[PDB]
């Protein structure tokens, strides 16, 4: 039967089922005030699917100049065409190759650039902004979004949204690499999965994805969404409460020192955006510092709500297109205030 919601992460994560239900705020605001992330499923059913295909981005924008990132080693591929990324999104035989002759796992950096999404793609902008869940929080002028209402004593978010496009990580060695490294944002965010590309050429890549979810600490109900309903899984997230950020900085200062890094005692390993917490580091955070997080598998059409101040990392299972909007809820405005 249709239901309003369910629970993931053994009851620690709210999952809302109807993205446009006018009563969602009643269930949402209790979890949100406690500093929890929230998942909302089904947003893809609200969107115009033809506006979110990799072949359309390549056809319309393919002659623009861009930089890419090699996810395996963080090398920058400078001043190539955006079609060189999009044409290898699902077809592995078309990807740019490293020296070793393997196809690369690539991220498209800062595209559309800065605040230009709305000017470059007005039809995409309308389709996303009219279908975001919890619209009193997430719309530019919603009643519970303080972004446009705050003085300069507060850090305000850039005009959005921002697009996040990257290939899926493939090998057993790739299990320890991030698509986006561990970082935090001083604003709240909603991140929507608008497209998942499961490739062909090295297609049959199914079983390394199951060992990644399992070792990723995903709950038993999340493992049912794969085997039972055959939904498309895009990305594995780990999110930590804002109150645990300093304990995570202490762990990463100790590990950087063990690995022979020579850092001052106050340097900030989260702001540096240089770490991905693999299975070894996640277990050390739990055992040695007492910190538990949320392991979240984002499927096609899932919207992840990330609280201001919460450290988070992202690992693409398959090729993903994500679109995110920043906002300033009243529950978390202390995180962007400039005076301590
Ligand atoms: C705009 C910047 C000025 C200081 C920074 N805010 C630090 C902060 C405040 C409150 C917290 C917290 C961290 O962790 C839990 O509660 C943001
Ligand atoms: Cl908080
Ligand atoms: Cl458009
Ligand atoms: Cl709302
Ligand atoms: Cl990163
Ligand atoms: Mn982020």
UniProtKB/Swiss-Prot annotation:
Ubiquitous. Highly expressed in placenta, skeletal muscle, kidney, heart and liver. It is found in: Nucleus. Fe cation binds at residues 183, 185, 312. Residues 121-340 form the JmjC domain. Signal peptide: none annotated. Its gene is located in the 5q region of the genome which is deleted in del(5q) interstitial deletion, a frequent deletion found in myeloid leukemias and myelodysplasias, suggesting that it may be a good candidate for the del(5q) tumor suppressor gene. Belongs to the JHDM2 histone demethylase family. Leu-Xaa-Xaa-Leu-Leu (LXXLL) motifs are known to mediate the association with nuclear receptors. Histone demethylase that specifically demethylates 'Lys-9' of histone H3, thereby playing a central role in histone code. Demethylation of Lys residue generates formaldehyde and succinate. May have tumor suppressor activity. It is linked to Diets-Jongmans syndrome: An autosomal dominant disorder characterized by varying degrees of intellectual disability, developmental delay, short stature, and characteristic facial features such as a wide mouth, a pointed chin, long ears and a low columella. This is Lysine-specific demethylase 3B. It comes from Homo sapiens (Human). The chain holds residues 1380 to 1717 of 1761 of the full protein.
